[PDB]
RNA sequence: UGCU
């Protein structure tokens, strides 16, 4: 729901390469920008499966 | 084979012998058309085996 | 719903419907595109 | 400067990627370290029992 | 692709005369009176037709058809 | 009285083309390794057998590689195309089958075919469906005709594999050591091992290093060990000269200072200096008999021959030493270039001998304790090894053989498809060994050496430049031969055998070594009747015509060279200031009685390598010949490679200028060939109205690229207007851009898989989730079918799906999850086709082609053939266009200062010719060294009535006054290239971040933002702006509050230290989020930053 | 891998 008026109509609508989760009454932002990852940081994760993860 | 883009940008540089001093400019819009200011050409080729 | 696709070497209008495998009759091609659309499309001559 | 206490350091540091393509994930190499660590650290127990 | 309605320079209607000029090939014509009698007295009109590539028959030949 | 001239000389390399040129070396190579390569290292592995349980044996009689085929069907083969293949994303190989022979239960059964692997098959090879095919099955078969092929498809990318470049071996290299002791090397690579030995002086005596010693050892103990115990023989071998005595005396003196005078207490201390892998006599007999110089044979523990060859080693180190005669790495008469089929060569026999060792393996498990039942090989023959190998090393391009200690990256590169032009470049390139290791200039640098075989301006400007060259357009690569005819010839010749006389005949000035590919094959006196002979006899055809001979004085030695890598180039024989090729022999070959063959057995024309010509005496030109001449120089144009030959007139150009030209034609945009419209790639540039250029080369017309051509001519005015083209830039017409001029087509590719878990689940694509208010699909999901994929013919926005996907969570009721494919773009995209493919796996793959036509705008970089590449800078109207008494307006107007400073005569000179053409209706020829002359287009100009030298009376279209300086019209070839500004723009809003540092992405594609490197840091520091410094790193970046104890100096987390257990000293602070991470990880390193706070007065 |  939206903190300022109540409504439940929120939805996800990215401006311009900006994720953000925003309410179509109002517009009152909920949450904005959202944390992935980078490729240098994506290579240097290693693959390891569930197989050895897990136990 | 001909793309949709080309082939309109082809007929729009045809030529057309309609005299314009009877016609005029159309609004900002109106992508309807009037009938003062817009003249419609149909083009319908289908292609077959003699 | 009638679903139709055509192959790519008979260009056969040809009717399956959701999960089947992906074949042609009276061939064994295994390239199936898909019909243009029906709906109007507005272009510009610039 | 003789260690008996490694520091672990929070998740922020080893970011985890939880790839649902596969039955697998994308793990730093200091989480492997660390495991790796802690089994030594079993087998040594397990070896002096 | 395909013969150019339009001249770049210009803009002369030329996409109408590359059969005529296709056919004056076919004949004995060569390019260069081929093209003066074709009614092309500037050389952009003469380039444009006779630079031209015709590939559309060779993109039809791969036609789904 | 001139020298006759053959005007049709030229004629030569349209028929060497027929059988070789660029493309067929791949092709050859592949058909080569797949026909006989293949079947000799079958035969060397045809017998394996395991230790236990004897009177096993699994014998391999012949394999067969077959024809292309897919395993797509039931357990069914059926021919596939190429194009098939791209499309849906598999291999193009075929499957490799053998008959083999073995004993289950000492009953010998026999298998006549049986499939053991897929060997990926190139295209236009033997095997491969698209060769023997004509145009018409080419398009039945969806494949371009004109497409050059030897290439390998697997998973859908076409990789190619480049020639690499490396040092011959078994060669003696002399060169200063590190410190710049001048010594010497010698690389021995044998089929199993490659030992690298090196001999240096740093103490005035000769010490051998190999890699199995624990210390060098003099040279001398070495001799005595290897049988000559005598110090005279030692030194009549070393040489009989004063110097020669005078620099070898050390050596004698330091062997004599200790106690080893035979063989067997030479023997006895190599055993002591050799390191761990009489027992140390027979490892240092061993040792000294395989693993020293391994290239040189002995018959039976007979060192003779290696003897001769360390002294010969010694007396070139001796005569090194004085005079500065130092042989040069960049020198490629000693590289050899390794093609594919080398390389698949060796990564089969080490797939094979792998596989053999796992069965060997598993019989050693299961035969002796499984069960009465009789084991066999069938059942644990796997036949997806080789298939999965082959695959990854042609994919990732990382090539590790453990049994030869390789380890290459970088092999095999995707294929550019940019252009035709392009593809055609990138096939003949040529990676060399270095890789970028250092910046040595050295081998980056032009050598001559590369006259006829490299391009010599064909270079890729950047970081790679020099390590990254082109073949020539003749030229051709030597394959390995028999060597038996080679050295029955040379020893019936009279070369006398090594063994029969003592070294002191080799310090002779008469006597000349001969060597046969590093290996000495003896001795002979007056080498000129030699070289003769053994030319003539090549000539004759009794030897291989690629069996190189070269001779060099300095050293006095002569080498055959037989091994394969060698690059050759045909040259014209000239006799008696005659060249043998004449006019007639010239009509023979234009009318079809005689072809390249004929006149290589005619001994007319014959292939020279590069230390062949060393010797040898080449003439450019009939008006050249003296009388000191050998060959003649078929075409001097051909100096140019692919890329290169699309210059016109590049003689008049600099060599930077032709560099900058052939790396934007490796770029340019145009037609690829004619399934480009059936062709799916993600990324593609198509030119709406392509035209072939006016001044068109001989090289243009051999590579068949006026078929295909990469750009338009355009009246192009060089003048200055508006001042909008100050540094490079150009000015474009609007009304010549309305008309068509320069439209291009961009198509990309968007790819979705519904593949099939282990689960019996699959993903599923959901129909349009109509508005029960408006009873439509939601403007997300508008442009979708009623089976849920976006249908072709309709306009994609941003932010909208292609393919409503939807897939399990569970890997009781499946619960799916949508992951639509969304389209990331800042313009709209029409979708031409959407192609459904089922995979093996049960696996759907979706392909939908969306196409943008653009239109040329400000920020587009355009090129004119020339390397004068530009960015549109203003597009004025035709009324502001100037015009002509004609009333033609230009369509480019170009700065003319950029000619002063880069000397680019070649363009002025292709724009008069282009003139001239279309004015008379011809296509001149801009061949380099040659092509049609400026008297010619000026006579034209002249004949058509406008002026000689280009300039024309033109007239000010915004004054409308004329101009007081005539304008220099004329048409140019110019080619759009790729980089556009549209892709090249970007504007990063706060965005997302990264999770391990709290900062903005890298690409573009990621949407990520610009860096502040240390030059921008440097800059705003010596500007000395803190405060824009400050918001730019710390505000605007990784700005973040963290909390931390005023005790003890630790960080804490919601007002509250854990380390403590109180929460009145913990304050607030603002710092970097790496900052923040570096504390972190200096912590987990032990290093405890303790951070003291204080008030900020 | 390309670009400056
Ligand atoms: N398009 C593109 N291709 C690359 C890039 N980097 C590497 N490649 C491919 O990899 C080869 C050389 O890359 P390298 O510099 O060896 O890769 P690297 O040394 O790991 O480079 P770093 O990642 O900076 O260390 C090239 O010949 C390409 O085959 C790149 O940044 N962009
Ligand atoms: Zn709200
Ligand atoms: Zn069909
Ligand atoms: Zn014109
Ligand atoms: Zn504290």
Redesign the interface.
Same mark, same amino acid.
């Given at each position: 729901r939206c903190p300022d008026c109540g409504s439940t109509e929120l939805v996800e609508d990215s401006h311009y390469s900006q994720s953000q989760l925003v309410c179509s009454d109002c517009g009152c932002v909920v949450t904005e920008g959202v944390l992935t990852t980078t490729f240098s940081d994506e290579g240097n994760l290693r693959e390891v499966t569930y197989s050895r993860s897990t136990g | 084979i001909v793309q949709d883009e080309i082939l309109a940008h082809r007929l729009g540089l045809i030529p057309i012998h309609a005299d314009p001093r009877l016609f005029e400019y159309r609004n900002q819009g109106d992508e309807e058309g009037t009938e003062i200011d817009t003249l419609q050409f149909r083009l319908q080729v289908r292609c077959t085996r003699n | 719903?009638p679903?139709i696709?055509?192959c790519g070497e008979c260009?056969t209008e040809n009717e399956i419907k959701?999960?089947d495998?992906?074949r042609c009759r009276e061939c064994?091609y295994?390239?199936?595109?898909?019909?243009?659309?029906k709906?109007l &499309? &507005?272009?510009?001559?610039? | 400067l003789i260690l008996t206490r490694l520091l672990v350091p929070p998740l922020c540091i080893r970011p985890s990627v939880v790839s649902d393509l596969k039955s697998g994930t994308n793990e730093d190499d200091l989480t492997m370290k660390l495991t790796e660590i802690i089994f030594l650290n079993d087998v040594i127990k397990k070896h002096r029992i | 692709m395909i013969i150019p309605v339009r001249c770049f320079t210009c803009g002369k209607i030329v996409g109408n005369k590359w059969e005529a000029y296709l056919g004056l090939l076919q004949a004995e014509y060569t390019e260069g009176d081929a093209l003066d009698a074709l009614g092309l007295k500037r050389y952009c009109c003469r380039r444009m037709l006779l630079a031209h590539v015709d590939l559309i028959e060779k993109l039809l030949n791969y036609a789904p058809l | 009285a001139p020298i006759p001239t053959v005007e049709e000389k030229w004629r030569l390399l349209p028929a060497f083309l027929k059988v070789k040129g660029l493309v067929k070396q791949h092709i050859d190579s592949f058909n080569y390794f797949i026909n006989v390569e293949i079947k000799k290292i079958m035969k060397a592995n045809e017998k394996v057998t395991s230790d236990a349980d004897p009177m096993w044996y699994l014998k391999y009689l012949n394999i067969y590689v077959g024809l292309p085929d897919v395993e797509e069907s039931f357990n069914v083969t059926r021919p596939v195309s190429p194009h098939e293949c791209r499309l849906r994303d598999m291999t193009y190989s075929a499957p490799i089958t053998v008959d083999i022979e073995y004993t289950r239960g000492s009953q010998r059964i026999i298998r006549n075919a049986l499939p053991i692997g897929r060997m990926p098959i190139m295209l236009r090879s033997s095997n491969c469906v698209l060769t023997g095919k004509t145009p018409a099955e080419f398009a039945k078969l969806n494949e371009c005709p004109l497409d050059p092929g030897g290439y390998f498809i697997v998973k859908g990318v076409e990789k190619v594999i480049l020639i690499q470049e490396q040092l011959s071996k078994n060669r003696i290299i002399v060169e200063a050591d590190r410190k710049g002791a001048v010594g010497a090397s010698v690389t021995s690579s044998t089929h199993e091992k490659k030992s690298r030995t090196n001999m240096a002086v740093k103490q005035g005596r000769f010490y051998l290093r190999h890699n199995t010693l624990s210390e060098d050892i003099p040279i001398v103990i070495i001799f005595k060990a290897m049988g000559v115990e005598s110090d005279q023989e030692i030194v009549q071998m070393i040489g009989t000269e004063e110097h020669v005595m005078a620099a070898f005396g050390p050596s004698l003196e330091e062997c004599q200072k200790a106690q080893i005078f035979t063989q067997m207490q030479a023997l006895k201390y190599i055993g002591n200096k050799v390191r761990r892998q009489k027992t140390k006599i027979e490892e240092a007999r061993e040792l000294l008999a395989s693993t020293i110089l391994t290239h040189v044979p002995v018959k039976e523990f007979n060192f003779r021959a290696k003897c001769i060859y360390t002294a010969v080693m010694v007396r070139r180190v001796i005569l090194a030493q004085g005079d500065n005669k130092v042989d040069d790495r960049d020198y490629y008469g000693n590289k050899r270039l390794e093609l594919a089929g080398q390389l698949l060569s060796l990564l089969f026999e080490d797939l094979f001998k792998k596989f053999n060792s796992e069965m060997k393996k598993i019989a050693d498990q299961v035969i002796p304790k499984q069960r009465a039942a009789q084991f066999d090989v069938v059942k644990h023959m796997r036949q997806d090894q080789i298939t999965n190998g082959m695959v990854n090393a042609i994919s990732t391009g990382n090539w590790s053989l453990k049994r030869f200690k390789m380890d290459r990256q970088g092999v095999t590169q995707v294929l550019s498809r940019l252009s035709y032009i392009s593809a055609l470049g990138m096939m003949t390139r040529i990676s060399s060994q270095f890789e970028k290791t250092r910046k040595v200039s050295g081998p980056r640098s032009l050598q001559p050496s590369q006259w006829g075989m490299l391009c010599p301006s064909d270079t890729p400007e950047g970081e790679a430049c020099g390590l990254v060259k082109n073949l020539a357009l003749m030229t051709h690569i030597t394959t390995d031969m028999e060597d038996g005819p080679i050295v029955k010839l040379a020893s019936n010749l009279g070369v006398e055998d090594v063994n029969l006389l003592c070294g002191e005949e080799l310090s002779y000035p008469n006597v000349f070594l001969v060597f046969l590919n590093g290996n000495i094959l003896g001795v002979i006196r007056d080498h000129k009747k030699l070289v003769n002979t053994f030319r003539l006899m090549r000539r004759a055809g009794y030897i291989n015509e690629f069996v190189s001979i070269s001779t060099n004085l300095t050293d006095r030695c002569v080498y055959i060279s037989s091994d394969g890598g060698r690059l050759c180039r045909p040259y014209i024989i000239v006799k008696k200031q005659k060249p043998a090729v004449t006019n007639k022999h010239m009509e023979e070959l234009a009318q079809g009685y005689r072809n390249f063959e004929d006149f290589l057995h005619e001994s007319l024309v014959e292939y020279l390598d590069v230390n062949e010509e060393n010797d040898c005496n080449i003439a450019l030109y009939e008006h050249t010949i003296n009388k000191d001449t050998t060959h003649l120089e078929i075409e001097p144009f051909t100096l140019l490679g692919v890329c290169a030959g699309l210059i016109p007139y590049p003689h008049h150009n600099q060599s930077p200028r032709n560099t900058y030209q052939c790396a934007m034609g490796k770029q340019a945009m145009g037609t690829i060939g004619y399934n480009q419209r059936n062709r799916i790639d993600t990324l593609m540039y198509l030119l709406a109205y392509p035209q072939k250029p006016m001044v068109k080369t001989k090289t243009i017309e051999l590579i068949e690229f006026e078929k295909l051509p990469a750009g338009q001519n355009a009246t192009v005015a060089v003048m200055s207007y508006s001042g909008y083209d100050i540094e490079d830039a150009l000015v474009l017409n609007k009304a010549s851009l309305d008309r068509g001029f320069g439209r291009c087509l961009v198509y990309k590719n968007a790819k979705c898989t519904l593949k099939r878990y282990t689960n019996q689940t699959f993903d599923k694509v959901m129909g349009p989730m109509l508005d029960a208010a408006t009873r439509k699909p939601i403007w997300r999901h508008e442009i979708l079918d009623a089976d849920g994929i976006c249908s072709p013919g309709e306009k994609v926005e941003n932010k909208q799906v292609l393919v409503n996907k939807s897939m399990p969570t569970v890997t009781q009721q499946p619960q799916y999850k949508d992951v639509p494919i969304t389209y990331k773009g800042a313009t709209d995209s029409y979708i031409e086709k959407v192609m459904i493919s089922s995979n093996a796996e049960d696996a759907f793959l979706i392909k939908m082609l969306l196409r943008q036509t653009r239109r040329p705008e400000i920020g587009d970089k355009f090129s004119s053939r020339h390397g004068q590449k530009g960015v549109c800078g203003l597009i004025v109207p035709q009324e502001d266009m100037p015009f002509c008494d004609s009333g033609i307006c230009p369509d480019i107007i170009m700065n003319p200062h950029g000619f002063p400073s880069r000397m680019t005569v070649g363009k002025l000179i292709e724009l008069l010719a282009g003139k001239a053409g279309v004015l008379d209706g011809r296509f001149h020829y801009g061949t380099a060294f040659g092509g049609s002359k400026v008297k010619d287009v000026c006579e034209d100009l002249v004949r058509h009535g406008y002026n000689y030298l280009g300039k024309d009376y033109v007239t000010s279209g915004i004054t409308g006054e004329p101009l007081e300086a005539y304008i220099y019209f004329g048409p140019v070839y110019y080619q759009k290239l790729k980089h556009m500004v549209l892709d090249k723009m970007h504007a990063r809003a706060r965005g997302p971040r990264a999770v391990l540092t709290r900062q903005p992405t890298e690409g573009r594609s990621r949407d990520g933002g610009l860096r502040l490197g240390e030059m921008e840091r440097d800059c705003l520091i010596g500007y000395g702006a803190s405060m824009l410094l400050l918001e730019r790193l710390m505000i605007s970046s990784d700005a973040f509050e963290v909390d931390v104890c005023g005790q003890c100096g630790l960080l804490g987390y919601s007002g509250w230290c854990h380390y403590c257990k109180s929460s009145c000293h913990v304050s607030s602070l603002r710092i970097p989020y790496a900052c923040k991470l570096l504390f972190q990880e200096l912590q987990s390193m032990n290093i405890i930053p303790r951070l003291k706070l204080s008030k900020y007065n």
């Open positions: - | - | 719903q679903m696709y055509i260009h959701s999960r495998p992906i064994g295994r390239i199936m595109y898909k019909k243009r659309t709906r &499309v &507005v272009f510009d001559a610039r | - | - | -």
